[PDB]
Design a protein around this ligand. Structure first.
Ligand SMILES: CC(C)CCC[C@@H](C)[C@H]1CC[C@H]2[C@@H]3CC=C4C[C@@H](O)CC[C@]4(C)[C@H]3CC[C@]12C
Ligand SMILES: CC(C)CCC[C@@H](C)[C@H]1CC[C@H]2[C@@H]3CC=C4C[C@@H](O)CC[C@]4(C)[C@H]3CC[C@]12C
Ligand SMILES: CC(C)CCC[C@@H](C)[C@H]1CC[C@H]2[C@@H]3CC=C4C[C@@H](O)CC[C@]4(C)[C@H]3CC[C@]12C
Ligand SMILES: OC[C@H]1O[C@H](O[C@H]2[C@H](O)[C@@H](O)[C@H](O)O[C@@H]2CO)[C@H](O)[C@@H](O)[C@@H]1O
Ligand SMILES: CC(C)NC[C@H](O)COc1cccc2[nH]c3ccccc3c12
Ligand SMILES: *C(=O)CCCCCCCCCCCCCCC
Length: 442
Protein backbone atom coordinates (compact mmCIF):
# COMPACT_ATOMS: atom_id res chain seq x y z
CA UNK A 1 0.00 0.00 0.00
CA UNK A 2 2.54 2.60 1.27
CA UNK A 3 5.78 0.78 0.18
CA UNK A 4 4.28 1.01 -3.34
CA UNK A 5 4.57 4.85 -3.02
CA UNK A 6 8.34 4.80 -2.43
CA UNK A 7 8.73 2.38 -5.39
CA UNK A 8 6.46 4.56 -7.56
CA UNK A 9 8.34 7.63 -6.32
CA UNK A 10 11.76 6.22 -7.29
CA UNK A 11 10.31 5.40 -10.74
CA UNK A 12 8.92 8.91 -11.28
CA UNK A 13 12.24 10.32 -9.95
CA UNK A 14 14.14 8.34 -12.61
CA UNK A 15 11.66 9.66 -15.21
CA UNK A 16 12.52 13.23 -14.18
CA UNK A 17 16.28 12.45 -14.18
CA UNK A 18 15.93 10.82 -17.63
CA UNK A 19 14.16 13.86 -19.13
CA UNK A 20 16.52 16.43 -17.60
CA UNK A 21 19.75 14.45 -18.31
CA UNK A 22 19.03 13.63 -21.94
CA UNK A 23 17.71 17.09 -22.91
CA UNK A 24 20.57 18.82 -21.07
CA UNK A 25 22.84 16.55 -23.17
CA UNK A 26 21.11 17.61 -26.45
CA UNK A 27 21.32 21.34 -25.64
CA UNK A 28 24.99 21.09 -24.64
CA UNK A 29 25.89 19.11 -27.82
CA UNK A 30 24.29 21.61 -30.24
CA UNK A 31 25.61 24.62 -28.24
CA UNK A 32 29.14 23.16 -28.05
CA UNK A 33 29.73 21.49 -31.44
CA UNK A 34 29.85 23.89 -34.45
CA UNK A 35 29.17 20.87 -36.72
CA UNK A 36 25.74 20.47 -35.09
CA UNK A 37 24.90 24.25 -35.35
CA UNK A 38 22.33 24.03 -38.17
CA UNK A 39 18.86 25.59 -38.49
CA UNK A 40 17.14 22.24 -37.81
CA UNK A 41 19.21 21.86 -34.63
CA UNK A 42 18.09 25.33 -33.43
CA UNK A 43 14.47 24.07 -33.53
CA UNK A 44 15.63 20.86 -31.88
CA UNK A 45 17.15 23.02 -29.13
CA UNK A 46 13.82 24.83 -28.80
CA UNK A 47 12.14 21.38 -28.57
CA UNK A 48 14.75 20.24 -25.99
CA UNK A 49 14.03 23.38 -23.83
CA UNK A 50 10.28 22.65 -23.76
CA UNK A 51 11.05 19.09 -22.62
CA UNK A 52 13.68 20.34 -20.14
CA UNK A 53 11.07 22.67 -18.57
CA UNK A 54 8.59 19.71 -18.47
CA UNK A 55 11.23 17.69 -16.59
CA UNK A 56 12.01 20.46 -14.05
CA UNK A 57 8.81 22.50 -13.69
CA UNK A 58 5.96 20.15 -14.70
CA UNK A 59 6.71 16.43 -14.10
CA UNK A 60 8.15 16.75 -10.52
CA UNK A 61 4.99 18.42 -9.14
CA UNK A 62 2.61 16.24 -11.15
CA UNK A 63 4.39 13.22 -9.57
CA UNK A 64 4.15 14.69 -6.04
CA UNK A 65 0.48 15.56 -6.59
CA UNK A 66 -0.26 11.88 -7.38
CA UNK A 67 1.90 10.34 -4.61
CA UNK A 68 0.59 12.72 -1.90
CA UNK A 69 -3.00 12.47 -3.31
CA UNK A 70 -3.41 16.25 -2.87
CA UNK A 71 -1.80 19.55 -3.90
CA UNK A 72 0.63 21.07 -1.32
CA UNK A 73 2.19 23.94 -3.34
CA UNK A 74 -0.85 26.29 -3.08
CA UNK A 75 -3.18 27.93 -5.62
CA UNK A 76 -0.70 30.42 -7.12
CA UNK A 77 1.72 27.72 -8.15
CA UNK A 78 -1.15 25.34 -9.21
CA UNK A 79 -2.27 27.89 -11.80
CA UNK A 80 1.36 28.70 -12.78
CA UNK A 81 2.28 24.99 -12.94
CA UNK A 82 -0.81 24.36 -15.08
CA UNK A 83 0.19 27.19 -17.48
CA UNK A 84 3.76 25.82 -17.98
CA UNK A 85 2.35 22.35 -18.62
CA UNK A 86 0.09 23.62 -21.45
CA UNK A 87 2.86 26.00 -22.77
CA UNK A 88 5.53 23.30 -23.09
CA UNK A 89 3.19 20.87 -24.87
CA UNK A 90 1.96 23.68 -27.21
CA UNK A 91 5.51 24.93 -28.00
CA UNK A 92 6.65 21.34 -28.68
CA UNK A 93 4.04 20.62 -31.39
CA UNK A 94 4.33 24.15 -32.84
CA UNK A 95 8.11 23.63 -33.17
CA UNK A 96 7.71 20.18 -34.68
CA UNK A 97 5.32 21.76 -37.14
CA UNK A 98 7.92 24.48 -37.96
CA UNK A 99 10.52 21.70 -38.55
CA UNK A 100 8.18 20.06 -41.06
CA UNK A 101 7.54 23.29 -42.99
CA UNK A 102 11.29 24.13 -42.88
CA UNK A 103 12.23 20.64 -44.14
CA UNK A 104 9.60 20.91 -46.90
CA UNK A 105 11.12 24.13 -48.27
CA UNK A 106 14.66 22.79 -47.72
CA UNK A 107 13.99 19.62 -49.75
CA UNK A 108 12.11 21.42 -52.58
CA UNK A 109 14.68 24.24 -52.90
CA UNK A 110 17.16 24.26 -55.82
CA UNK A 111 19.80 24.81 -53.07
CA UNK A 112 18.42 21.50 -51.69
CA UNK A 113 18.41 20.81 -47.93
CA UNK A 114 19.69 24.25 -46.97
CA UNK A 115 16.92 25.85 -45.02
CA UNK A 116 15.62 29.01 -46.68
CA UNK A 117 16.18 30.62 -43.23
CA UNK A 118 19.36 32.11 -41.81
CA UNK A 119 20.39 31.33 -38.19
CA UNK A 120 19.02 34.76 -37.08
CA UNK A 121 15.64 34.39 -38.83
CA UNK A 122 15.40 30.91 -37.20
CA UNK A 123 15.86 32.52 -33.73
CA UNK A 124 13.01 34.94 -34.52
CA UNK A 125 10.73 32.06 -35.64
CA UNK A 126 11.60 30.22 -32.41
CA UNK A 127 11.02 33.31 -30.25
CA UNK A 128 7.68 33.81 -32.07
CA UNK A 129 6.75 30.16 -31.37
CA UNK A 130 7.30 30.69 -27.60
CA UNK A 131 5.38 34.00 -27.68
CA UNK A 132 2.41 32.44 -29.58
CA UNK A 133 2.44 29.34 -27.34
CA UNK A 134 2.49 31.67 -24.29
CA UNK A 135 -0.30 33.79 -25.75
CA UNK A 136 -2.40 30.61 -26.29
CA UNK A 137 -1.42 28.90 -22.94
CA UNK A 138 -0.83 31.58 -20.27
CA UNK A 139 -3.56 34.07 -21.33
CA UNK A 140 -6.60 31.68 -20.97
CA UNK A 141 -5.28 30.10 -17.75
CA UNK A 142 -4.18 33.42 -16.11
CA UNK A 143 -7.37 35.21 -17.40
CA UNK A 144 -9.50 32.30 -16.02
CA UNK A 145 -11.16 31.55 -19.43
CA UNK A 146 -10.62 27.82 -18.96
CA UNK A 147 -12.73 27.45 -15.80
CA UNK A 148 -15.99 25.58 -15.43
CA UNK A 149 -19.04 27.08 -13.69
CA UNK A 150 -20.29 23.97 -11.76
CA UNK A 151 -19.92 23.70 -7.95
CA UNK A 152 -17.45 20.73 -7.80
CA UNK A 153 -15.02 22.80 -9.90
CA UNK A 154 -15.70 26.03 -7.94
CA UNK A 155 -14.85 24.12 -4.73
CA UNK A 156 -11.58 22.85 -6.28
CA UNK A 157 -10.61 26.35 -7.48
CA UNK A 158 -11.10 27.90 -4.05
CA UNK A 159 -9.49 24.84 -2.38
CA UNK A 160 -5.72 25.42 -1.96
CA UNK A 161 -4.99 21.67 -1.80
CA UNK A 162 -7.05 20.88 -4.92
CA UNK A 163 -5.35 21.23 -8.30
CA UNK A 164 -7.65 19.50 -10.81
CA UNK A 165 -7.85 20.98 -14.28
CA UNK A 166 -11.65 21.32 -14.56
CA UNK A 167 -12.44 23.23 -17.74
CA UNK A 168 -15.49 24.52 -19.57
CA UNK A 169 -16.30 22.69 -22.83
CA UNK A 170 -15.70 25.69 -25.14
CA UNK A 171 -12.15 25.93 -23.77
CA UNK A 172 -11.69 22.15 -23.91
CA UNK A 173 -12.58 22.19 -27.64
CA UNK A 174 -11.01 25.53 -28.72
CA UNK A 175 -7.74 25.18 -26.79
CA UNK A 176 -7.13 21.57 -27.87
CA UNK A 177 -7.88 22.37 -31.56
CA UNK A 178 -5.70 25.52 -31.66
CA UNK A 179 -2.84 24.24 -29.46
CA UNK A 180 -2.67 20.62 -30.71
CA UNK A 181 -4.88 19.54 -33.63
CA UNK A 182 -4.10 22.48 -35.94
CA UNK A 183 -0.27 22.16 -35.85
CA UNK A 184 -0.56 18.30 -35.78
CA UNK A 185 -2.64 18.09 -38.98
CA UNK A 186 -0.30 20.55 -40.72
CA UNK A 187 2.83 18.68 -39.52
CA UNK A 188 1.55 15.31 -40.72
CA UNK A 189 0.35 16.65 -44.08
CA UNK A 190 3.50 18.64 -44.77
CA UNK A 191 5.95 15.97 -43.60
CA UNK A 192 4.19 13.27 -45.66
CA UNK A 193 5.01 15.58 -48.65
CA UNK A 194 8.64 15.71 -47.47
CA UNK A 195 8.87 11.90 -47.72
CA UNK A 196 7.25 11.93 -51.19
CA UNK A 197 9.86 14.50 -52.26
CA UNK A 198 12.71 12.59 -50.67
CA UNK A 199 11.51 9.38 -52.44
CA UNK A 200 11.20 11.29 -55.72
CA UNK A 201 14.91 12.27 -55.61
CA UNK A 202 15.93 8.63 -55.90
CA UNK A 203 17.41 8.06 -59.37
CA UNK A 204 20.33 6.34 -61.09
CA UNK A 205 22.84 8.84 -59.63
CA UNK A 206 21.69 8.18 -56.11
CA UNK A 207 21.55 4.47 -56.82
CA UNK A 208 25.23 4.39 -57.92
CA UNK A 209 26.24 6.87 -55.24
CA UNK A 210 24.83 4.34 -52.70
CA UNK A 211 26.14 1.19 -54.50
CA UNK A 212 29.59 2.47 -55.73
CA UNK A 213 30.32 5.49 -53.52
CA UNK A 214 31.23 9.02 -54.53
CA UNK A 215 34.92 9.90 -54.03
CA UNK A 216 35.98 13.54 -54.31
CA UNK A 217 39.74 12.80 -54.37
CA UNK A 218 41.70 10.62 -56.82
CA UNK A 219 42.15 7.02 -55.65
CA UNK A 220 43.47 3.73 -56.99
CA UNK A 221 40.69 1.25 -57.86
CA UNK A 222 40.90 -2.55 -57.27
CA UNK A 223 43.09 -2.99 -60.41
CA UNK A 224 45.45 -0.19 -59.19
CA UNK A 225 44.10 2.37 -61.72
CA UNK A 226 43.59 6.07 -60.95
CA UNK A 227 39.86 6.69 -60.50
CA UNK A 228 37.60 9.49 -59.20
CA UNK A 229 33.91 10.08 -58.39
CA UNK A 230 31.53 7.15 -58.93
CA UNK A 231 34.19 4.77 -60.25
CA UNK A 232 35.18 7.09 -63.13
CA UNK A 233 38.44 5.76 -64.59
CA UNK A 234 40.94 8.49 -65.52
CA UNK A 235 43.76 6.46 -67.09
CA UNK A 236 45.44 3.07 -66.86
CA UNK A 237 48.86 4.80 -66.49
CA UNK A 238 50.86 4.55 -63.22
CA UNK A 239 51.64 8.30 -63.44
CA UNK A 240 49.47 10.31 -61.06
CA UNK A 241 50.22 13.49 -63.02
CA UNK A 242 48.76 11.65 -66.08
CA UNK A 243 45.49 11.05 -64.15
CA UNK A 244 45.41 14.72 -63.03
CA UNK A 245 45.94 15.82 -66.65
CA UNK A 246 42.98 13.67 -67.79
CA UNK A 247 40.88 14.85 -64.83
CA UNK A 248 41.48 18.54 -65.62
CA UNK A 249 40.74 17.90 -69.30
CA UNK A 250 37.49 16.09 -68.29
CA UNK A 251 36.35 18.57 -65.61
CA UNK A 252 37.67 21.76 -67.31
CA UNK A 253 39.96 23.33 -64.68
CA UNK A 254 43.02 22.72 -62.51
CA UNK A 255 41.65 20.29 -59.96
CA UNK A 256 44.88 19.02 -58.39
CA UNK A 257 43.04 15.72 -57.78
CA UNK A 258 40.02 17.15 -55.92
CA UNK A 259 36.50 17.66 -57.41
CA UNK A 260 33.11 18.74 -56.02
CA UNK A 261 30.14 16.39 -55.62
CA UNK A 262 28.31 18.19 -58.46
CA UNK A 263 31.31 17.74 -60.78
CA UNK A 264 31.31 13.94 -59.86
CA UNK A 265 27.66 13.96 -60.96
CA UNK A 266 28.63 15.66 -64.26
CA UNK A 267 31.19 12.93 -65.05
CA UNK A 268 28.66 10.31 -63.98
CA UNK A 269 25.94 11.48 -66.39
CA UNK A 270 28.56 11.20 -69.17
CA UNK A 271 29.56 7.70 -68.05
CA UNK A 272 25.85 6.75 -67.97
CA UNK A 273 25.50 8.14 -71.50
CA UNK A 274 28.50 6.03 -72.59
CA UNK A 275 27.14 2.86 -70.86
CA UNK A 276 23.76 3.14 -72.62
CA UNK A 277 25.38 3.60 -76.08
CA UNK A 278 27.50 0.57 -75.35
CA UNK A 279 24.46 -1.51 -74.26
CA UNK A 280 22.64 -0.52 -77.47
CA UNK A 281 25.67 -1.65 -79.57
CA UNK A 282 25.81 -5.02 -77.76
CA UNK A 283 23.66 -7.63 -79.59
CA UNK A 284 22.91 -9.51 -76.32
CA UNK A 285 22.04 -6.51 -74.10
CA UNK A 286 20.15 -4.38 -76.63
CA UNK A 287 16.93 -6.51 -76.73
CA UNK A 288 16.90 -6.75 -72.95
CA UNK A 289 17.47 -3.03 -72.33
CA UNK A 290 14.94 -2.12 -75.05
CA UNK A 291 12.27 -4.16 -73.22
CA UNK A 292 12.91 -2.85 -69.71
CA UNK A 293 11.20 0.09 -68.01
CA UNK A 294 13.27 3.13 -66.87
CA UNK A 295 13.94 1.87 -63.30
CA UNK A 296 15.10 -1.62 -64.43
CA UNK A 297 17.22 0.02 -67.16
CA UNK A 298 19.04 1.86 -64.25
CA UNK A 299 19.44 -1.61 -62.71
CA UNK A 300 21.11 -2.93 -65.89
CA UNK A 301 23.35 0.14 -66.20
CA UNK A 302 24.32 -0.33 -62.53
CA UNK A 303 25.57 -3.84 -63.38
CA UNK A 304 27.36 -2.59 -66.53
CA UNK A 305 29.10 0.05 -64.32
CA UNK A 306 30.37 -2.76 -62.03
CA UNK A 307 31.27 -5.64 -64.46
CA UNK A 308 31.32 -4.09 -67.97
CA UNK A 309 29.15 -5.19 -70.91
CA UNK A 310 30.87 -8.53 -71.34
CA UNK A 311 30.46 -9.47 -67.68
CA UNK A 312 26.75 -8.65 -67.91
CA UNK A 313 26.28 -10.24 -71.38
CA UNK A 314 27.35 -13.53 -69.79
CA UNK A 315 24.11 -13.71 -67.72
CA UNK A 316 22.42 -15.40 -70.69
CA UNK A 317 19.54 -17.05 -68.79
CA UNK A 318 18.89 -14.06 -66.48
CA UNK A 319 18.83 -11.67 -69.48
CA UNK A 320 16.25 -13.84 -71.27
CA UNK A 321 14.08 -13.98 -68.16
CA UNK A 322 14.34 -10.24 -67.67
CA UNK A 323 13.37 -9.78 -71.36
CA UNK A 324 10.22 -11.89 -70.67
CA UNK A 325 9.43 -10.04 -67.36
CA UNK A 326 9.98 -13.28 -65.38
CA UNK A 327 11.42 -11.18 -62.55
CA UNK A 328 11.52 -13.75 -59.71
CA UNK A 329 13.19 -16.33 -61.92
CA UNK A 330 15.68 -13.73 -63.15
CA UNK A 331 16.38 -12.98 -59.43
CA UNK A 332 16.84 -16.69 -58.64
CA UNK A 333 19.53 -16.92 -61.33
CA UNK A 334 21.21 -13.57 -60.59
CA UNK A 335 21.50 -14.53 -56.88
CA UNK A 336 23.60 -17.63 -57.99
CA UNK A 337 26.52 -15.51 -59.39
CA UNK A 338 30.07 -14.60 -58.45
CA UNK A 339 28.67 -11.05 -58.50
CA UNK A 340 26.26 -11.79 -55.61
CA UNK A 341 28.98 -13.85 -53.91
CA UNK A 342 31.38 -10.86 -53.87
CA UNK A 343 29.10 -7.82 -53.46
CA UNK A 344 25.93 -9.41 -51.86
CA UNK A 345 24.48 -6.20 -50.39
CA UNK A 346 24.76 -4.26 -53.64
CA UNK A 347 23.60 -7.26 -55.65
CA UNK A 348 20.68 -7.73 -53.23
CA UNK A 349 19.53 -4.12 -53.89
CA UNK A 350 19.88 -4.32 -57.71
CA UNK A 351 18.17 -7.74 -58.00
CA UNK A 352 15.31 -6.65 -55.71
CA UNK A 353 15.06 -3.58 -58.00
CA UNK A 354 14.74 -5.98 -60.97
CA UNK A 355 12.00 -7.70 -58.91
CA UNK A 356 9.84 -4.64 -58.07
CA UNK A 357 10.72 -2.03 -60.69
CA UNK A 358 10.78 0.66 -57.98
CA UNK A 359 13.51 2.43 -56.02
CA UNK A 360 12.28 0.88 -52.68
CA UNK A 361 15.64 -0.94 -52.06
CA UNK A 362 17.41 2.48 -51.98
CA UNK A 363 15.05 4.11 -49.43
CA UNK A 364 16.79 5.50 -46.36
CA UNK A 365 20.25 4.64 -47.63
CA UNK A 366 21.42 8.26 -48.03
CA UNK A 367 22.54 10.04 -44.82
CA UNK A 368 20.12 12.90 -45.61
CA UNK A 369 17.18 10.50 -46.04
CA UNK A 370 18.15 8.71 -42.81
CA UNK A 371 18.12 12.17 -41.09
CA UNK A 372 14.58 12.75 -42.47
CA UNK A 373 13.43 9.40 -40.95
CA UNK A 374 14.89 10.51 -37.55
CA UNK A 375 12.78 13.67 -37.66
CA UNK A 376 9.76 11.63 -38.80
CA UNK A 377 10.32 9.41 -35.75
CA UNK A 378 10.37 12.43 -33.41
CA UNK A 379 7.09 13.62 -34.93
CA UNK A 380 5.36 10.24 -34.91
CA UNK A 381 6.43 9.48 -31.35
CA UNK A 382 5.09 12.84 -30.12
CA UNK A 383 1.84 12.16 -31.96
CA UNK A 384 1.38 8.66 -30.56
CA UNK A 385 2.23 9.80 -27.01
CA UNK A 386 -0.20 12.79 -26.95
CA UNK A 387 -2.99 11.77 -29.39
CA UNK A 388 -4.85 9.49 -26.92
CA UNK A 389 -4.84 12.19 -24.23
CA UNK A 390 -6.20 14.83 -26.66
CA UNK A 391 -8.81 12.44 -28.11
CA UNK A 392 -10.17 12.01 -24.55
CA UNK A 393 -10.46 15.84 -24.10
CA UNK A 394 -12.84 15.93 -27.06
CA UNK A 395 -14.65 12.66 -26.11
CA UNK A 396 -15.39 14.29 -22.71
CA UNK A 397 -16.86 17.36 -24.46
CA UNK A 398 -19.26 14.93 -26.22
CA UNK A 399 -19.96 12.76 -23.15
CA UNK A 400 -18.07 13.53 -19.92
CA UNK A 401 -16.91 10.82 -17.43
CA UNK A 402 -16.95 8.01 -20.08
CA UNK A 403 -13.26 7.22 -19.33
CA UNK A 404 -12.06 6.91 -15.73
CA UNK A 405 -9.94 9.64 -14.11
CA UNK A 406 -7.07 7.16 -13.63
CA UNK A 407 -7.05 6.31 -17.35
CA UNK A 408 -7.04 10.01 -18.29
CA UNK A 409 -4.17 10.66 -15.84
CA UNK A 410 -2.22 7.69 -17.25
CA UNK A 411 -2.71 9.02 -20.82
CA UNK A 412 -1.28 12.36 -19.62
CA UNK A 413 1.81 10.61 -18.19
CA UNK A 414 2.37 8.90 -21.56
CA UNK A 415 2.44 12.47 -22.88
CA UNK A 416 4.84 13.62 -20.10
CA UNK A 417 7.19 10.64 -20.59
CA UNK A 418 7.56 11.55 -24.30
CA UNK A 419 9.82 14.41 -23.08
CA UNK A 420 12.46 11.71 -22.40
CA UNK A 421 12.53 10.00 -25.84
CA UNK A 422 13.92 12.49 -28.35
CA UNK A 423 17.44 12.38 -26.85
CA UNK A 424 17.41 8.57 -27.42
CA UNK A 425 15.95 9.00 -30.92
CA UNK A 426 18.86 11.37 -31.80
CA UNK A 427 21.33 8.51 -31.20
CA UNK A 428 20.26 7.42 -34.75
CA UNK A 429 22.44 10.32 -35.96
CA UNK A 430 26.17 9.56 -36.23
CA UNK A 431 26.89 13.24 -35.37
CA UNK A 432 24.88 13.28 -32.10
CA UNK A 433 26.18 9.86 -31.16
CA UNK A 434 29.76 11.22 -31.65
CA UNK A 435 28.80 14.43 -29.85
CA UNK A 436 27.32 12.56 -26.83
CA UNK A 437 30.16 10.06 -26.33
CA UNK A 438 32.62 13.00 -26.31
CA UNK A 439 30.49 14.79 -23.68
CA UNK A 440 30.24 11.57 -21.57
CA UNK A 441 34.09 11.15 -21.64
CA UNK A 442 34.32 8.17 -24.02
C1 LIG B 1 17.02 18.43 -9.51
C2 LIG B 1 17.58 17.51 -10.59
C3 LIG B 1 16.64 17.45 -11.80
C4 LIG B 1 18.96 17.98 -11.02
C5 LIG B 1 19.77 16.88 -11.70
C6 LIG B 1 20.39 17.40 -13.00
C7 LIG B 1 21.41 16.43 -13.60
C8 LIG B 1 20.68 15.55 -14.61
C9 LIG B 1 22.63 17.23 -14.14
C10 LIG B 1 23.54 17.74 -12.99
C11 LIG B 1 24.99 17.64 -13.46
C12 LIG B 1 24.83 17.42 -14.95
C13 LIG B 1 26.05 16.91 -15.72
C14 LIG B 1 27.24 17.82 -15.47
C15 LIG B 1 28.33 17.63 -16.49
C16 LIG B 1 28.16 16.98 -17.67
C17 LIG B 1 29.34 16.87 -18.61
C18 LIG B 1 28.86 17.48 -19.93
O1 LIG B 1 29.99 17.72 -20.78
C19 LIG B 1 27.70 16.65 -20.52
C20 LIG B 1 26.52 16.68 -19.57
C21 LIG B 1 26.84 16.35 -18.10
C22 LIG B 1 27.06 14.84 -17.97
C23 LIG B 1 25.68 16.84 -17.21
C24 LIG B 1 24.37 16.04 -17.43
C25 LIG B 1 23.22 16.52 -16.54
C26 LIG B 1 23.60 16.54 -15.07
C27 LIG B 1 23.89 15.13 -14.54
C1 LIG C 1 11.38 28.21 -16.46
C2 LIG C 1 11.91 27.58 -15.18
C3 LIG C 1 10.75 27.27 -14.25
C4 LIG C 1 12.75 26.33 -15.46
C5 LIG C 1 14.19 26.64 -15.89
C6 LIG C 1 14.26 27.25 -17.30
C7 LIG C 1 15.55 26.98 -18.06
C8 LIG C 1 15.69 25.48 -18.27
C9 LIG C 1 15.65 27.74 -19.41
C10 LIG C 1 15.32 29.25 -19.36
C11 LIG C 1 16.16 29.95 -20.43
C12 LIG C 1 16.78 28.79 -21.22
C13 LIG C 1 18.02 29.08 -22.07
C14 LIG C 1 17.70 30.11 -23.14
C15 LIG C 1 18.78 30.23 -24.19
C16 LIG C 1 19.75 29.30 -24.38
C17 LIG C 1 20.77 29.54 -25.49
C18 LIG C 1 21.02 28.26 -26.30
O1 LIG C 1 22.09 28.45 -27.27
C19 LIG C 1 21.28 27.03 -25.42
C20 LIG C 1 20.13 26.84 -24.44
C21 LIG C 1 19.84 28.04 -23.54
C22 LIG C 1 21.06 28.28 -22.63
C23 LIG C 1 18.55 27.80 -22.71
C24 LIG C 1 18.71 26.66 -21.68
C25 LIG C 1 17.45 26.45 -20.84
C26 LIG C 1 17.01 27.73 -20.15
C27 LIG C 1 18.12 28.16 -19.17
C1 LIG D 1 7.42 30.97 -17.74
C2 LIG D 1 8.56 29.96 -17.86
C3 LIG D 1 8.36 28.85 -16.82
C4 LIG D 1 8.61 29.39 -19.28
C5 LIG D 1 10.02 29.06 -19.79
C6 LIG D 1 10.32 29.86 -21.06
C7 LIG D 1 11.71 29.61 -21.68
C8 LIG D 1 12.20 28.18 -21.43
C9 LIG D 1 11.68 29.99 -23.19
C10 LIG D 1 11.34 31.48 -23.40
C11 LIG D 1 12.12 31.97 -24.63
C12 LIG D 1 12.70 30.70 -25.24
C13 LIG D 1 13.93 30.85 -26.14
C14 LIG D 1 13.64 31.70 -27.36
C15 LIG D 1 14.76 31.61 -28.40
C16 LIG D 1 15.74 30.66 -28.40
C17 LIG D 1 16.80 30.71 -29.49
C18 LIG D 1 17.36 29.33 -29.91
O1 LIG D 1 18.66 29.45 -30.56
C19 LIG D 1 17.51 28.32 -28.77
C20 LIG D 1 16.23 28.23 -27.95
C21 LIG D 1 15.79 29.58 -27.34
C22 LIG D 1 16.87 30.09 -26.43
C23 LIG D 1 14.42 29.46 -26.61
C24 LIG D 1 14.44 28.38 -25.51
C25 LIG D 1 13.24 28.40 -24.56
C26 LIG D 1 12.95 29.79 -24.03
C27 LIG D 1 14.14 30.27 -23.22
O1 LIG E 1 32.41 -0.90 -66.97
C1 LIG E 1 31.81 0.40 -67.12
C2 LIG E 1 32.26 1.43 -66.06
O2 LIG E 1 33.48 0.98 -65.38
C3 LIG E 1 34.17 1.92 -64.53
O3 LIG E 1 33.51 2.00 -63.23
C4 LIG E 1 33.54 0.76 -62.41
C5 LIG E 1 34.96 0.19 -62.16
O4 LIG E 1 35.54 -0.39 -63.34
C6 LIG E 1 34.99 -0.97 -61.18
O5 LIG E 1 36.35 -1.12 -60.73
C7 LIG E 1 34.08 -0.81 -59.97
O6 LIG E 1 33.92 -2.07 -59.31
O7 LIG E 1 32.79 -0.36 -60.38
C8 LIG E 1 32.83 0.92 -61.03
C9 LIG E 1 31.39 1.44 -61.07
O8 LIG E 1 30.55 0.83 -60.07
C10 LIG E 1 34.26 3.09 -65.53
O9 LIG E 1 35.43 4.02 -65.32
C11 LIG E 1 32.95 3.80 -65.74
O10 LIG E 1 33.14 5.10 -66.28
C12 LIG E 1 32.32 2.84 -66.72
O11 LIG E 1 31.01 3.26 -67.14
C1 LIG F 1 -2.18 17.67 -15.42
C2 LIG F 1 -2.69 18.49 -16.61
C3 LIG F 1 -2.85 19.97 -16.28
N1 LIG F 1 -1.77 18.35 -17.73
C4 LIG F 1 -2.03 19.00 -19.01
C5 LIG F 1 -1.46 18.21 -20.19
O1 LIG F 1 -0.16 17.73 -19.90
C6 LIG F 1 -1.39 19.10 -21.41
O2 LIG F 1 -2.68 19.62 -21.67
C7 LIG F 1 -2.96 20.48 -22.69
C8 LIG F 1 -1.95 20.98 -23.53
C9 LIG F 1 -2.24 21.85 -24.57
C10 LIG F 1 -3.54 22.25 -24.82
C11 LIG F 1 -4.57 21.80 -24.04
N2 LIG F 1 -5.93 22.01 -24.03
C12 LIG F 1 -6.50 21.29 -23.01
C13 LIG F 1 -7.78 21.12 -22.54
C14 LIG F 1 -8.02 20.30 -21.45
C15 LIG F 1 -6.99 19.63 -20.80
C16 LIG F 1 -5.68 19.76 -21.24
C17 LIG F 1 -5.42 20.58 -22.32
C18 LIG F 1 -4.26 20.88 -22.95
C1 LIG G 1 32.82 13.24 -18.57
O1 LIG G 1 32.66 14.17 -19.39
C2 LIG G 1 31.75 12.98 -17.54
C3 LIG G 1 32.19 13.47 -16.15
C4 LIG G 1 31.26 14.53 -15.53
C5 LIG G 1 30.97 14.24 -14.05
C6 LIG G 1 30.44 15.50 -13.36
C7 LIG G 1 29.93 15.21 -11.95
C8 LIG G 1 28.50 15.73 -11.79
C9 LIG G 1 28.02 15.58 -10.35
C10 LIG G 1 26.53 15.23 -10.28
C11 LIG G 1 25.83 15.75 -9.01
C12 LIG G 1 24.64 16.69 -9.26
C13 LIG G 1 23.30 16.15 -8.72
C14 LIG G 1 22.27 17.26 -8.49
C15 LIG G 1 21.02 16.72 -7.81
C16 LIG G 1 20.04 17.83 -7.43
Amino acid sequence: DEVWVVGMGIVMSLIVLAIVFGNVLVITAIAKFERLQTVTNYFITSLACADLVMGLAVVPFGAAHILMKMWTFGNFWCEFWTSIDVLCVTASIETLCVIAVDRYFAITSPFKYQSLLTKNKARVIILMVWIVSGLTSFLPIQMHWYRATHQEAINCYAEETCCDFFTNQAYAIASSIVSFYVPLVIMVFVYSRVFQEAKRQLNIFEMLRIDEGLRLKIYKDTEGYYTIGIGHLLTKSPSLNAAKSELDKAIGRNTNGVITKDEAEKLFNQDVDAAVRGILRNAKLKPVYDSLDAVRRAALINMVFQMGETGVAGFTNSLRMLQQKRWDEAAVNLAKSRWYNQTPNRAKRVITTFRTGTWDAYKFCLKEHKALKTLGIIMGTFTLCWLPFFIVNIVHVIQDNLIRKEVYILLNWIGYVNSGFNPLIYCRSPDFRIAFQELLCL
